[PDB]
Amino acid sequence: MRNYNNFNRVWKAPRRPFEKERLDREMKLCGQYGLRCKREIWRVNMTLSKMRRTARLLLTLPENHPRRLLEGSAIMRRCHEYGFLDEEKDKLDYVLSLTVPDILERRLQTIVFKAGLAKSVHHARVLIQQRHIAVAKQIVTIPSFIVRVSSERHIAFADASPFGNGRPGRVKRVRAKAAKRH
Amino acid sequence: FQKKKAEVCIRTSQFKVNKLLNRKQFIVEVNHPHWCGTVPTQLIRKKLATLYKVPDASQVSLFGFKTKFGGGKTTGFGLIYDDLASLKRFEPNYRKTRMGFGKARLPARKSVKERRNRNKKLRGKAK
Amino acid sequence: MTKTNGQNAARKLVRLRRRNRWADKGWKRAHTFAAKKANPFGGSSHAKGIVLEKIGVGAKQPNSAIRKCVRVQLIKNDKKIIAFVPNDGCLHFIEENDEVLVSGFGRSGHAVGDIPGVRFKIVKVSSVGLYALYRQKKEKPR
Amino acid sequence: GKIHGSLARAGKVKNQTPKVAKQEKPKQPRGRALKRLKYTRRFLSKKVHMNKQPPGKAG
RNA sequence: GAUUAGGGUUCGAUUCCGGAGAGGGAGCCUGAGAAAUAGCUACCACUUCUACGGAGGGCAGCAGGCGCGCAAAUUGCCCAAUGUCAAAACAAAACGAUGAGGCAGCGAAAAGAAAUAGAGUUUUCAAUGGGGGAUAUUUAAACCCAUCCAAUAUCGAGUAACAAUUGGAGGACAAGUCUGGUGCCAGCACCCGCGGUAAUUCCAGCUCCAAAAGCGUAUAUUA
Ligand SMILES: NC[C@@H]1O[C@H](O[C@H]2[C@@H](O)[C@H](O[C@@H]3[C@@H](O)[C@H](N)C[C@H](N)[C@H]3O[C@H]3O[C@H](CO)[C@@H](O)[C@H](O)[C@H]3N)O[C@@H]2CO)[C@H](N)[C@@H](O)[C@@H]1O
Numbered sequence: 001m002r003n004y005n006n007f008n009r010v011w012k013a014p015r016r017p018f019e020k021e022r023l024d025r026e027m028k029l030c031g032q033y034g035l036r037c038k039r040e041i042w043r044v045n046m047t048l049s050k051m052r053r054t055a056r057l058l059l060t061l062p063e064n065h066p067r068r069l070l071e072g073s074a075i076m077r078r079c080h081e082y083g084f085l086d087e088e089k090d091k092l093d094y095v096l097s098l099t100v101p102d103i104l105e106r107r108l109q110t111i112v113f114k115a116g117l118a119k120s121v122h123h124a125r126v127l128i129q130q131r132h133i134a135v136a137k138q139i140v141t142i143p144s145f146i147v148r149v150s151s152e153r154h155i156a157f158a159d160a161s162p163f164g165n166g167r168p169g170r171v172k173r174v175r176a177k178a179a180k181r182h
Numbered sequence: 183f184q185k186k187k188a189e190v191c192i193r194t195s196q197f198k199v200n201k202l203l204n205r206k207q208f209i210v211e212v213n214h215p216h217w218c219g220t221v222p223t224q225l226i227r228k229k230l231a232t233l234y235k236v237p238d239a240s241q242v243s244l245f246g247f248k249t250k251f252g253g254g255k256t257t258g259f260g261l262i263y264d265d266l267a268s269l270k271r272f273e274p275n276y277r278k279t280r281m282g283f284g285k286a287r288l289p290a291r292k293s294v295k296e297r298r299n300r301n302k303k304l305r306g307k308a309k
Numbered sequence: 310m311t312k313t314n315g316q317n318a319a320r321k322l323v324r325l326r327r328r329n330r331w332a333d334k335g336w337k338r339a340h341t342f343a344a345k346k347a348n349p350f351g352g353s354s355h356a357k358g359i360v361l362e363k364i365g366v367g368a369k370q371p372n373s374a375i376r377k378c379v380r381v382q383l384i385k386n387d388k389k390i391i392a393f394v395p396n397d398g399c400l401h402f403i404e405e406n407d408e409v410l411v412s413g414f415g416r417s418g419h420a421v422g423d424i425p426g427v428r429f430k431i432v433k434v435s436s437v438g439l440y441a442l443y444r445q446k447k448e449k450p451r
Numbered sequence: 452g453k454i455h456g457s458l459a460r461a462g463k464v465k466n467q468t469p470k471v472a473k474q475e476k477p478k479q480p481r482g483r484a485l486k487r488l489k490y491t492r493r494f495l496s497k498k499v500h501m502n503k504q505p506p507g508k509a510g
Numbered sequence: 511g512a513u514u515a516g517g518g519u520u521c522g523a524u525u526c527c528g529g530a531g532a533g534g535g536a537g538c539c540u541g542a543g544a545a546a547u548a549g550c551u552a553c554c555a556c557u558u559c560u561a562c563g564g565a566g567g568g569c570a571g572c573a574g575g576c577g578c579g580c581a582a583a584u585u586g587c588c589c590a591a592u593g594u595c596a597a598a599a600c601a602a603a604a605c606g607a608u609g610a611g612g613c614a615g616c617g618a619a620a621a622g623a624a625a626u627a628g629a630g631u632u633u634u635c636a637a638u639g640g641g642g643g644a645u646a647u648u649u650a651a652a653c654c655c656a657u658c659c660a661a662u663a664u665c666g667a668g669u670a671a672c673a674a675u676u677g678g679a680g681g682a683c684a685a686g687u688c689u690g691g692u693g694c695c696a697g698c699a700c701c702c703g704c705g706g707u708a709a710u711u712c713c714a715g716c717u718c719c720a721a722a723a724g725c726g727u728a729u730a731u732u733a
């Protein structure tokens with residue numbers, strides 16, 4: 001009862017659950033990025049909505065204000081750090097132009113497809129969740145892992161994975177047992 | 183993949199000499215690639231004994247480890263005392279019992295609660 | 310011709326609004342106690358009751374059927390009400406002297422369309438769910 | 452008479468429904484692979500009628 | 511706290527602070543502090559043991575029990591941590607007490623993360639969980655998670671049967687002029703409306719749509 005650990009909600013369901021324009025865009029986003037459900041889109045809506053709302057508050061504030069120099073250089077920093085904005089985009093008006101496919105390109109499911117470690121985007125989500133990709137010699141099993149810019153150089157196969165330098169996986173190993181009893 | 187005997191290397195991060203309580207306290211991280219399972223605390227105890235040159239390998243105290251996700255390494259807290267007689271003095275009973283030497287467990291507390299309520303009625307030498 | 314300004318006219322505006330909120334049938338129902346003392350459920354939902362008798366309530370024009378519904382007497386306050394039994398069949402799952410779990414249906418106690426004067430609904434009979442008996446997920450005890 | 456329905460006629464149509472059984476039909480993929488199956492048919496395999504029915508007695 | 515452009519409209523028994531109460535109502539003693547209730551005295555309402563002389567009760571403490579209801583868990587393990595008390599550091603024949611408080615069992619209140627497959631030329635190749643288990647690790651002790659199937663030497667997917675559901679398909683509102691049945695009947699339908707022998711609406715089969723380890727419904731309440 002006396003537990004003060006915090007928790008909040010990360011996604012929000014849309015108003016108007018049957019919009020034929022919206023339902024067609026989100027089925028493209030579930031196909032082009034290999035997503036499980038519409039809720040994984042909807043947290044990328046709320047992630048980007050909160051960036052689009054704070055950056056629109058800071059432009060109400062003048063320049064050489066304390067809450068715009070601090071904390072406006074923080075939101076441009078995390079866009080440059082996670083690959084949301086390339087380094088030319090530094091004016092804070094580019095956060096207001098970010099889209100949901102700009103955030104979905106930074107998921108570990110997408111880079112493992114774009115770096116070339118997997119044939120399809122549904123090949124990438126299997127290999128993450130089946131413990132094959134290490135970001136910095138750290139096995140990451142989360143597909144919604146947002147990859148930073150500095151982490152792109154070091155994505156490879158895991159050192160414990162059978163595809164890397166680890167022991168052979170199940171279908172070879174249970175076949176290597178069946179050839180052993182004979 | 184190339185098969186080799188699984189090697190444990192051991193590292194101490196933030197070290198501190200505690201002149202109070204007569205000990206050296208630190209956190210110790212163990213890297214164990216190609217290992218099968220988790221490294222036992224007893225095997226970390228002898229390898230941390232050689233790295234600090236302690237005269238008796240059982241005066242090292244190593245409690246709770248947390249294996250890192252993905253494998254490859256653990257990290258826990260470490261304690262090395264100046265004396266083994268100082269170990270039996272300042273360690274808790276539960277870490278002593280995990281090292282073998284320690285006091286055997288008391289009777290279950292529900293029993294000593296009921297007997298003490300029965301003695302609240304009595305007065306003489308009976309209780 | 311409507312309202313008053315004036316920088317010191319707030320007591321007039323506070324009194325003016327508190328009387329005109331009583332004309333709001335949502336504000337007046339949320340702030341008077343005839344709302345719950347006459348509600349057959351005690352200002353709550355899903356009240357239990359005992360089935361007394363089966364009624365066939367004929368539908369309103371332009372429809373024409375008879376709606377299969379039971380009259381139940383609630384346990385929490387002993388109020389007799391008539392409640393509808395939803396689905397094809399389903400008075401075959403209700404006998405007299407059965408405990409039934411009765412919710413409202415729809416419109417906050419305002420008699421969903423065809424059925425005249427019935428504003429409650431059977432949810433669960435003999436502590437097993439009535440829609441589970443229809444789809445034959447499970448069957449009645451005893 | 453005035454009323455043509457009775458409480459005795461309860462469950463008339465559901466009793467005389469002819470009771471067809473469902474067929475075998477191997478399972479569809481679940482979860483992320485079912486969204487892959489939705490996407491490939493409505494986009495990659497080219498008004499757009501999502502459930503076009505074969506011609507019946509209306510023409 | 512919920513919702514909110516702005517102005518607001520609501521909820522706050524509930525973890526922190528304060529106030530009040532210990533079955534109702536009094537009155538006290540002792541103490542630095544009580545009008546104390548795991549203190550006392552009395553009455554009222556219930557109430558337990560009796561060898562009939564008498565003697566006791568107070569769970570709005572923690573587990574539980576019966577009722578009451580639409581509606582809420584274990585008569586669990588422990589002081590290891592957080593603290594409190596105190597004649598009191600720990601250790602040595604030689605472990606202070608703690609239903610405070612932790613810990614675990616139940617637990618779809620509500621929240622995070624996430625499987626139910628991938629890849630290729632009918633036909634194969636790789637995967638790794640769910641799950642079984644340890645030299646062990648966690649833990650006060652277990653549990654969980656984490657790590658692991660040799661380090662000389664560790665089990666395992668194919669219908670991967672290890673099988674996704676809940677509500678819909680006239681309109682709003684996304685998705686059938688399909689087939690069978692019934693014939694203002696049975697039922698559906700929040701609202702508009704369906705059903706009167708060719709039912710886009712009922713009962714079903716198929717096929718689709720929506721959200722998905724969730725999804726209906728009811729009553730409050732904000733937009
Ligand atoms: N007339 C009866 C109506 O029923 C409602 O009752 C409930 C439902 O009918 C309704 O459920 C709706 C569902 O119909 C609709 N198809 C989609 C919507 N997401 C659901 O909403 C519900 O489910 C979501 C889960 O995503 C919950 O997060 C959400 O809080 C909850 N309201 O949400 C309500 C919560 O149980 C209203 N309570 C009631 O005031 C209203 O009058």
Ligand SMILES: [Mg+2]
Binds near residue numbers: 131160
């Ligand atoms: Mg592995």
Ligand SMILES: [Mg+2]
């Ligand atoms: Mg308080």
Ligand SMILES: [Mg+2]
Binds near residue numbers: 554
């Ligand atoms: Mg009285």
Ligand SMILES: [Mg+2]
Binds near residue numbers: 569
């Ligand atoms: Mg209790």
Ligand SMILES: [Mg+2]
Binds near residue numbers: 709
């Ligand atoms: Mg027809």
Ligand SMILES: [Mg+2]
């Ligand atoms: Mg149908």
